[PDB]
Amino acid sequence: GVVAAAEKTKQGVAEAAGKTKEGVLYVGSKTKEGVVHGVATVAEKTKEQVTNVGGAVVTGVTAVAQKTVEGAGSIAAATG
Amino acid sequence: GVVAAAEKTKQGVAEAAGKTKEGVLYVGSKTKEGVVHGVATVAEKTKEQVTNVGGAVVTGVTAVAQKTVEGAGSIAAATG
Amino acid sequence: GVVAAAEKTKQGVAEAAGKTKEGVLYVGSKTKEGVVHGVATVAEKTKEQVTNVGGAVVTGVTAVAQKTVEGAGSIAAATG
Amino acid sequence: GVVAAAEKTKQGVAEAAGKTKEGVLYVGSKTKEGVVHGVATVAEKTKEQVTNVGGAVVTGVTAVAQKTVEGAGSIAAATG
Amino acid sequence: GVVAAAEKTKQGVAEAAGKTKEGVLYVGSKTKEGVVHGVATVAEKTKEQVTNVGGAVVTGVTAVAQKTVEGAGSIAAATG
Amino acid sequence: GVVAAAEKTKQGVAEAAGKTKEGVLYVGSKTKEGVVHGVATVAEKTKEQVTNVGGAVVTGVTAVAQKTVEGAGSIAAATG
Amino acid sequence: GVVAAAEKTKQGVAEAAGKTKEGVLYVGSKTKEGVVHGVATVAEKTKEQVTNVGGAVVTGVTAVAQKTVEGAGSIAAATG
Amino acid sequence: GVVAAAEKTKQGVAEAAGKTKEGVLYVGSKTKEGVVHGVATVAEKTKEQVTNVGGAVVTGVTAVAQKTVEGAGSIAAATG
Amino acid sequence: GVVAAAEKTKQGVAEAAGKTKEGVLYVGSKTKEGVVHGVATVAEKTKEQVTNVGGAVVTGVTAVAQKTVEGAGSIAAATG
Amino acid sequence: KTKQGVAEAAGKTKEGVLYVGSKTKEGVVHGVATVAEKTKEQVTNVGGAVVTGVTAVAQKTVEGAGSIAAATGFVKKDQL
Amino acid sequence: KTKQGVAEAAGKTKEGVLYVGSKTKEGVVHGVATVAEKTKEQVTNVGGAVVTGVTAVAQKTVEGAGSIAAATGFVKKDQL
Amino acid sequence: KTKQGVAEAAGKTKEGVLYVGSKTKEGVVHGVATVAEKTKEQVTNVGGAVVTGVTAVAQKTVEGAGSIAAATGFVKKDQL
Amino acid sequence: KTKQGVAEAAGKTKEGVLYVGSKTKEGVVHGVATVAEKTKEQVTNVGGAVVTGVTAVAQKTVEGAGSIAAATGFVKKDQL
Amino acid sequence: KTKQGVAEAAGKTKEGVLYVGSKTKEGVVHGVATVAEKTKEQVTNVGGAVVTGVTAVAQKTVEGAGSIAAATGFVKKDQL
Amino acid sequence: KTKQGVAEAAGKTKEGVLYVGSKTKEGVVHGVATVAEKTKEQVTNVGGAVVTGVTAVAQKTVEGAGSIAAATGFVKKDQL
Amino acid sequence: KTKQGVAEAAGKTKEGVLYVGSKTKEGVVHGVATVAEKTKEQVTNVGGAVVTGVTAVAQKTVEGAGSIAAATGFVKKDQL
Amino acid sequence: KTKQGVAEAAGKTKEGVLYVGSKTKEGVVHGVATVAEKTKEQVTNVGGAVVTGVTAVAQKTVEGAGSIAAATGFVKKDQL
Amino acid sequence: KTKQGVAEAAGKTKEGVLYVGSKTKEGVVHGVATVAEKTKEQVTNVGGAVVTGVTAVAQKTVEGAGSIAAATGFVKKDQL
């Protein structure tokens, strides 16, 4: 039982609410989720080698922002 | 039982709400999910090699923003 | 039971709502999901080699923004 | 039971709503999903080689924005 | 049971709604899904080679915006 | 049961709606799905070679905006 | 049961609707699905070669906007 | 049961509708589906070669806007 | 059961509709489906060669707007 | 000498294709698109002006002191 | 000499493709798109001005002292 | 000499593709998009001005002392 | 000499692709997007000005002493 | 000499791709986006000015002594 | 000589890609986004000014002594 | 000589990619985002000024003695 | 000579990637974000000024003796 | 000579990546974020000034003797 009342008033406001659930709000904000910024490499000879024979390999520069709900959020998964 | 009332008022507002669920709102914000920004490479000889023989390989510069709901959110998956 | 009432008022507003669910709203915002920005490479000799023999390979510069619902959101999948 | 009422009012508004579900709305916003912006390469000799023998290979500059619902959202899939 | 009423009013509005589901709306917004913008390559000798023998290969500059519903949204698929 | 009523009013509007489902609407917006914009290549000798022997190959500059519903939305598919 | 009523009113409007489903509408908007814009190539010698022996090959500058409903939306398909 | 009524009104409108399904409408909009715009090539010697021996090859500058309903929407199909 | 009524009115309109399905309408809009616009080539020697031996080849500048309903919408098909 | 509102162009070439264009727009109204769907309008006017339609007016004048382009919806009762 | 509102261009080439363009817009209204769907409007006017429509006016004047482009929706009762 | 509001361009090339463009906009209104959906408006005016529509006015004047572009929705009762 | 509001460009090349552009905007209104959904407005005016619509005005003037661009929604009762 | 509000650019190259651009904006209003959803407004005006809409005004003037861009929502009752 | 508000750029290259840009903004309003959801406003005005909307004004003036950009919502009752 | 508010840039290269940019902002308002959700406002004004909306004003002036940008919400009753 | 408010840059390279940028901001308002949720405001004004909204003003002036940027919410009753 | 408010940069390299930047901010307001949630405000004003909103003002002046940036919420009753 929720009741609000206003009467005999020049400017009256009556506001009622049974159940309320506030939510997220960003005002003038900034965010950085999974960011790579400013990587420099000065070599003479570079060499990479990957010899995957049935798994999962993730190399190089990476930036991930997974947001899964009802499952594995792996980056490199390998099941058998 | 939710009740609001206004009467005998020059300017009256009555507002009622049983159940309310607020939601997300961005006002003047910025976001960065899965971003690669400013990568520099100054070499003389470069060499890459990938010899995948039945798996999953992900290389180079990468930027992912997966948002799955009811499944695996892998980047490199390898099942058998 | 949700009730709102206004009476004997010059300017009256009565507003009622049983159940309400607010939603997302962006006002003057910016977003960046899965972005690659500013990659520079100054070499003399470059060489890439991929010898996939039955899997999944993803190379080079990449920018993905998957939003799947009821399935795997892999980037490089390899099942057997 | 949702009721709104206005009476004996010069300017009256009565508004009722049983169930309401708000929706997404962008006002003056910008978005960037799966974007590659500003890639520069200054070499002398370049060489690429791909020798796929029955899988999936994705190379070069890529920008994807998959939005699948009831299926795998892979970029390079390889089943057998 | 949803009821709205206005009476004895110079300017009256009564509006009722059982169930309502709001929808997406863009007002003065911009979007970028799967975009490649500003790629420059200054070499002297370039060479590409692809020797696919029964799979799927996707190379070069790419920009995809798949929006499938009830099927795989791969970019390079290879089944057998 | 949805009811709206107006009476004894100089200007009255009564509007009722059982079930309503709003829809998408773009007002003064811009979109970019699957776009390649501003690619420059300054070489001296260029050479491409493709030797597909029974699969699917997609090369060069590409820009796709698939919107399938009940089928695979691949770019390069190869089944057997 | 949906009812709207107006009576004893100088200007009255009564509007009722059982079920309503709004639809898409673009007002003063612009779209770009599958677009290639501004590609420049300044070489001295160019050479392309394609030796397809029973698959599907798609090269050059491409811009596709497939919108299939009940079938594969591939760009290069190869079945056997 | 949908009912609207107006009576004892100088200007009355009664409008009823059982089921309604709105449709797409473009007002002052522009669209670009499958467009190639602004491709320039300044070489000295150019050479193309295609040696298809029983598949499908699509080269050169291309711009497609397929809208199939109950069939494959491939660009280069090759079945056997 | 859909009913509308007007009576005792100087200007009355009664309009009823059981089921309604709105349709597409373009007002002051422009469209571009499958368009090639502004291709320039400044070489000294050009040479093309096609040696199809039983498949389908499509080259040169192309602009297609297929709209099939119950069949494959390929550009280059090759069955056997 | 004096130049106002002048669009000028020039072009020289020895061999090749040439295009020169010069367009000028002064006092031009272009593209006024309007839709009214299922709209109710009720007007009662007594000795006044009511405007509800679409009015597109363009004017260009040289030596036009005291010019008026569009005077819409007004009541003028000057004594002198 | 004097230049106001001038768009000028020039171009020289010996061999190749050339494009020169010069456009000028002065006092131009472009692209006024408006939609009103299921809208109710009720106006009672007594000796005044009411404007509800769309008014797009463009004007260009040389030597236009005291110019007015659009005077919309006004009541003028000057004594002198 | 004097330059105001001037857009100027120039270009030289010996071999290749050339593009030169020069555009100028002065007193230009571009892109006014408006939607009103399920909106109720009720106006009672007695000897005044009410404006609710869309008014897009553009003006350019040379030697325009005392110029007015848009005077919308006003009541002028000057004695002299 | 004197330069105000001037956009100037230049470009030289011997071989290759060239682009030169120069744009100027002076007194320009671009992109005014507005939506009103399920909005109730009730106005009673007696000898005044009420403005609720959209007013986009752009003006450019040379030698414009005493210029006014947009005078919206006002009551002027000057004695002299 | 004198330079005010000038955007200038230059570029030289022997071989390769070149881009030169110069843009200027003076007195420009860009991107005014507004939404009002389920909003109630009630106004009673007696001899005054009420403004509730959207007013986007841009102005540029040379030699504009005493210029006014936008005078919105005011009551002027000067004696002299 | 004198430089005010000048954006200048220059660039030289022998071989490769070049980009030169110069932009200037003076008296510019960019990006005014506003939303009002489920908002109640009630105004009673008697001989005054009330402003509740959105007012975006931009102005640029040369030799503008005594300039005013935006005078919004005021009551002026000067004796002289 | 004299430099005020000048953005200048320069760049030299022999081989490779080059970018030169120069931007200037003077009297610029950028990004004013505002939201009002479920807000109640009640105003009673008698011969005064009330301001509740959004006012974004930008101004740039050369030789502007006595300039005013934004005078909002005021009551001026000067005797002389 | 004299330098005020100057942003200057320079860059030299023989081979590789180069970036040069120069930006200047003078009298600039950037990013004013505001939210009001479930807020009640009640104002009674009698011959005064009340300000509750958002006011973003930016100004730049050269030779501006006696300049005022923003005079908000004031009562001026000067005798002389 | 004289330098005030100057941002200067320089850079030299023979091979590799280079970045040069120079930014200047003078009289700049950046990032004013404000939230009011479930706030009650009640104001009664009689011949005064009340300010409750957000006021972001930025100003830059050269030769500005006697300049004022923001005069907010004041009562001025000077005799002379």
Author numbering:
A (entry chain M), B (entry chain K), C (entry chain S), D (entry chain Q), E (entry chain W), F (entry chain U), ...: 14 to 93
J (entry chain P), K (entry chain Z), L (entry chain b), M (entry chain V), N (entry chain X), O (entry chain R), ...: 21 to 100
Question: Could you share sentences copied from the article?
Answer:
Previous structural studies of these filaments by cryo‐electron microscopy (cryo‐EM) revealed three discrete folds distinct from α‐synuclein filaments associated with other neurodegenerative diseases. The 3.3‐Å resolution structure of the Type I2 filament reveals a fold consisting of two asymmetric protofilaments, one of which adopts a novel structure that is chimeric between two previously reported protofilaments.
Here, we use cryo‐EM to identify a novel, low‐populated MSA filament subtype (designated Type I2) in addition to a predominant class comprising MSA Type II2 filaments.
